[PDB]
């Protein structure tokens, strides 16, 4: 069911919904890293997992700021 | 030098008052920083010492002669770009003040230069993910530096989403390699190069192919380059390719150890499509930056053929091609920024709107450049004929060396296709030359008192006032003659490329 | 003492013209004295430069040994080796001779920018001349395609109404085809590590690889001679390019394909050249026959001359691919003779009639001998030279090329004799119309051929007659060089 | 390849600064004043605003000197480092280094010096700082620890070279020198 | 001479899974942050370590 | 080496001369610019010659090892 690109329907029809999809996709990689590190008893993989969480948080902030300013520009006359 | 000086500039810029003059002088400070960085790097890093390859910072980074050459190229090209914002490009306040409006312009560039230089040096999958995001985030900020521009913010929104998906693919590939092997250091992974899924590295390359606008992911790159300001498009369309292509060559160098034929075919398939879209795509377009975006896609495809072959001749071909293409890229965008002073002023059909961010936006805005400035027009013609591949310009030798690597490794189909694509792309390349000069003899006896340059006041009616500032005109003059007169020193330059080794030794 | 002096002097010549004309361009609103009389003092300097270029090769000609086998005047310059043999020496002289002739043709018939035109013409003459004295494939290709950039701008700026279409045709036809020749050159540098003339001539490659290399090289050559069916660009370019551009294109550029066969095919791909010879003859014979019949239906005056060059160079291709000395010498003789008669026909059509009436349609002209007797004398004489009438160099070239073709292939090579009839059919039908009947009702009486146009016609006619009556001036130089190109094992 | 004797693969920050030649301070001073000079030079080449020369404000001159001060020191630091690495002529540095090491050995003191870092941290610190000068132009990182991974053998300091006989240095065996790995694991093999 | 020179440089030596360059100069595990002596599965003795493979410098 | 640096200085004059045409000034405008331009590329030419001379030494040393590798292959 994945090869027919079923996930393209589960994503909503708003720009912020695309942002949510990216966070979920990146979160799946981090969960996989924790899964492998825990089985191996490897703290190096848990270091990688922590880095992925911190880096993904930075990505969300930058993307939101661009989207905030993009919404600001349209409602920017502010004559009142 | 970069990191320490960046912190000082960050604090200093926020302390002094907000003004165009201080921002321009701060931009010159950034120019000195990059120049000092180049001097320090050249003092300690040499080609001979780095031939073996030296690990750094607990083997997280690995520098060799191949990596060092690109870093030196990155610093040099960044110096030429800062000259645009550190000096006048047209001499007119209404046009030039855009570069001096944003104080964080030089700060964001210094952030990206750190990412660009460290990316080819990555030796761990963890630091690979960290650095690729460091470079990607800096590009998003630079694309959105003009936050009062609707197109600039829209492009950055597009850039963020496409790059984030590519970063996820890159992260997904590295995580899958860790699951199979449990190791994060690349050199440790090379011990198991014959026991890991080699198509996981193809997933890694797919993320890198997105970040360089390769087909089928070309569409976002063309849209972003056309909408972004010319001063921003000049950076974001060249700098990411300097570092990512170098990293792709290293990854392909490791992949060729197992020599997976299926891996080569998939990359060949993407190169074949990129040559089709790169050539036929630019045939029917009216924007100059849209035309250059297709030109960028086509030339990256030519370099990828050298990268895919990954042999001794590929090192010579790639190093030469990336250096000469960057110089041609700088020269063309430098001329485009300057020639905005020859635009006629209305004093209407098609209701054409031109903004201050992209004064030159259409190919036909280059009309009568042969009459307006014969030396600048010839400089553009030399650059365009280099992209075509007319010998003995720098462009011909780049394609000549790429063909050598492609045909030596047996890529007969791609070599023939790249030459058909070159002929097809010559059509839109020649269109630029047609606009510049083909109406010279009919418009020689014409009067133009409505040009932008005509609005510039004179000093005393006796001073010989040049139309162009000293710095930008000198850079165009230097780059044009290097492209034209490469035959004089071609033999020695290739000998320098002979000594760039990626673990060849003997 | 040749390439170094030729490049340095011409580069200094280019700089000298640029400094003088572009000194006062700084929105001075000036008048200046160099621009007086349509920039006479700038045209004169460029004309002097072309004359000096001829003297440069003459100094090396004095030391040329016709009894010495191998390249002479071997020189290292720009990391490139340069040399001269019998075949190269004559082709260089022809290229440099047409320099002043091309400049003098557009002396006072350009709308402006004479300095740009003069520099472009001299640049093209030197670049084409250097292409005959390079000693490797890479250097051959560099000069083979370097002429495209000056020529593309020259046609697009100084061209006729359809100059835009002509500029696209010459740029794309001659580049897309030459790139296939570059592929064969790249293959040589991959498997032999060198593209030197002497080095690659001694290497025998596999019969399949020679077939692939021959096809790649012949595509670039066949488009440039040109041969059917890749010839359609040439009539468009000639009918729209300026007269000086037509002279260089018809007199020099089309001869690079014949010289390319000498350097790139015969001594290095000798085994596959024998196999390809029947195919080359079939293409060239059809090129000769079809072009002559197509010329009978053309209405543009300059297009008719353009198609005539295609038929003659088909004979040159036939002669040069014959595996005997008679065919090879005749092909080289015909190239030199065509290098003078063909520009003269363009001068008569595109330089004399066009500069007065500005219309190239054939329906406007008839009975021109009534008020232009001097024009008709040269038109008739050059028409007979173009048709291969004896006492002209074209006859010597055509007869030996036909004879060499019959020696190479008695059955199908005999068809080359049809050039004697077919060439007279279209050339005389044009000349008979232009001189016969009453003077045209659509033309006003005006000046006959002036002194400047008399000079151009006379000094293009003189070499043709000298070569035609005493071709031993040319044969003696060529005999030793041409004998090396023959491949045969008689036992 | 111009190669010389290897002194220290990871020289200490104090050792690099102490071994500065007079030219190293000269290049440090030129870097300090060069950056303000370049701002003057850039204005002379093309003024920031207008067509006439205008001196940059003193606030720009102060920050430019600070940038040049760190830039000059980094250049000097790299030049001195190559002498320890052997990439540059270091006969002056070899003689000074050998005298210091022999003096420390004669006192039964480690040439590297006592460290607050345990055996793992000393090795870890060396891995982070070794060859980090290659990226000193990108970001700084210095060896500010007394670790024992310097890529040399203390045995080569026992042989007497020319001009060192008059030094009158007596060298005890390495196993009797404090703060050395060969003289620490006496009771336990896993604890120094 | 030029043809001979280019043949040497342009020749790419064969690489496979049995012969290729790995840039590791030492064996890890001599010191761990804590609990260095684990299940005694580390059989590599650093007191009797054989000489490592050294990288080749063609310019030296 | 003087002829080499003379050529580099000649190249620097060409760059300045080409700059004058771009800026639309007479070629005698500020003649001191040619002195600055020539000396700038002389400094680049001096460094370029050192780069090429150093590269020739490195190439020869590597060629020796390549010939040894080729001899083993041809046996
Ligand atoms: C101390 C004051 C100082 O040195 O900076 C002057 C500056 C003067 O402030 P001001 O009087 O309002 O400025 C008036 C004029 O604009 C002042 O104009 P200005 O041009 O004279 O100041 C600009 C300044 C540029 O300022 C900086 O670059 C400081 C960057 C520090 C980070 O450039 C310089 O003056 C160079 C000398 C001072 C900086 C030397 C720092 C060496 C690096 C350490 O003070 C600061 O920059 C404050 C930033 C640091 C605050 C304290 C942060 C402490 C963090 C660690 C805490 C835990 C320990
Ligand atoms: C993209 C961004 C990337 C990130 C970039 C961000 C920046 C990261 C890089 C930052 C720098 C790298 C450091 C990373 C963390 C290292 C931490 C560490 O290893 O501490 C171990 C270290 C203990 O290791 P240890 O084996 O016992 O060695 C003791 C001394 O360090 C060794 O004793 P000594 O013989 O060297 O001399 C002791 C005494 C000097 O007394 C003497 O007797 C020296 C005699 C010669 C004097 C020559 C003067 C040279 C200095 C001018 O004081 C010193 O000179 C210590 C040298 C450090 C000078 C200040 C550092 C300047 C760096 C800028 O802990 C410390 O207390 C280090 C003190 C140095 C100050 C902090 C260094 C960071 C600032
Ligand atoms: C600014 C130009 C500075 C040129 C410095 C070139 C350089 O970085 O060194 C050459 C480098 C290899 O250097 P390396 O082998 O490591 O050490 C030996 C150095 N003699 O090789 C390289 O990697 C350099 C590759 C880039 C080559 C750039 C060529 C110059 C670009 C044109 C400069 C235009 C100058 C415009 C002037 C504007 C100001 C008016
Ligand atoms: C002697 C000298 C010879 C020199 C030239 C040699 C090459 C000659 C090429 C001959 C083929 C092209 C000439 C004929 C094509 C005419 C196109 C055409 O008539 O219309 C386009 C056609 C749709 O037809 P339509 O738009 O409705 O036009 C009305 C027709 N009654 O649209 C179509 O249906 C075309 C099919 C769809 C597009 C297919 C594209 C796939 C790739 C094609 C090859 C490109 C290879 C490029 C390689 C480099 C780039 C990878
Ligand atoms: C304006 C005019 C221009 C020119 C017009 C066309 C004329 C030129 C082409 C026509 C041919 C010219 C003469 C060629 C024939 C001469 C050779 C000959 O003598 O014919 C007989 C000969 C066979 O000799 P034989 O000894 O019997 O062979 C024994 C083998 N054991 O060899 C043969 O078997 C004869 C070969 C077959 C005949 C070929 C002739 C047809 C050519 C058609 C061309 C297209 C029309
Ligand atoms: C200590 C850090 C601050 C340096 C103080 C010395 C200084 O800046 O001198 C002042 C002078 C500015 O001149 P001015 O503003 O006209 O004098 C006051 C007029 N009422 O400043 C100048 O003239 C500019 C010349 C450079 C000043 C020294 C810059 C280096 C600052 C220390 C860097 C240390 C790292
Ligand atoms: C007086 C100082 C002038 C420079 C002196 C010098 O050493 O330059 C080298 C060369 C002089 O010749 P030489 O050193 O004897 O070695 C032959 C290399 N040409 O002098 C030169 O090579 C200068 C050549 C400049 C002209 C080259 C421009 C190329 C023209 C376009 C290419 C056309 C052919 C392809
Ligand atoms: C053999 C090596 C030669 C290489 C260098 C040649 C000179 C380059 C031009 C610099 C000077 C300049 O641009 O000057 C312009 C000159 C002078 O023309 P003008 O009528 O006075 O100019 C008009 C000004 N008016 C109207 C006020 C008088 O015209 C040229 O452009 C001629 C030379 C270029 C011809 C070919 C162009 C494409 C080259 C592509 C290379 C692959
Ligand atoms: C192997 C030997 C190769 C020889 C050359 C190959 C054919 C060259 C055609 C000239 C085109 C030209 O001139 O481009 C210009 C022409 C303009 O057309 P126009 O004349 O104005 O009429 C048409 C315009 N209308 C209808 C308005 C009147 O635009 C084209 O056609 C654009 C497509 C050209 C692509 C050429 C790529 C060739 C790939 C390599 C061979 C497979
Ligand atoms: C209006 C203007 C129109 C155009 C006019 C053109 C006039 C040309 C001027 C004469 C030049 C001259 O004489 O060059 C000669 C000099 C000295 O050569 P060498 O040191 O022996 O080098 C060896 C030369 N071999 C190999 C032929 C023997 O080379 C130069 O300096 C080269 C100039 C740089 C060319 C650009 C390519 C190199 C870029 C390096 C960084 C990437
Ligand atoms: C040792 C190596 C460096 C060379 C020494 C000189 C450095 C420059 C400082 C002098 C002052 C200056 O540049 O002054 C500025 C001048 C003049 O500009 P203008 O437009 O006439 O100004 C108008 C002034 N009026 C009104 C009086 C006329 O600009 C130039 O001449 C530009 C060329 C820069 C120097 C050459 C650099 C070459 C680098 C290329 C190598 C990769």
Residue numbers in the entry:
A (entry chain K): 1 to 80
B (entry chain N): 1 to 347, 365 to 523
C (entry chain M): 1 to 491
D (entry chain O): 1 to 192
E (entry chain h): 123 to 182
F (entry chain d): 1 to 75
What do the authors report?
Mitochondrial NADH [reduced form of NAD+ (nicotinamide adenine dinucleotide)]:ubiquinone oxidoreductase [complex I (CI)] is a large multisubunit enzyme located in the inner mitochondrial membrane where, together with the other electron transport chain complexes, it maintains the proton-motive force and the NADH/NAD+ redox balance that are required for adenosine 5′-triphosphate generation and a host of metabolic processes (1–3). The process catalyzed by CI comprises a redox reaction coupled to proton translocation across the inner mitochondrial membrane. In the hydrophilic domain, two electrons are passed from NADH to ubiquinone [typically ubiquinone-10 (Q10)] via a flavin mononucleotide (FMN) and an extended chain of iron-sulfur (FeS) clusters, forming ubiquinol, which is reoxidized to sustain the electron transport chain and reduce O2 to H2O. Here, we report the structure of isolated CI from the yeast Pichia pastoris (Pp-CI) and identify distinct closed and open states that resemble those of mammalian CI.
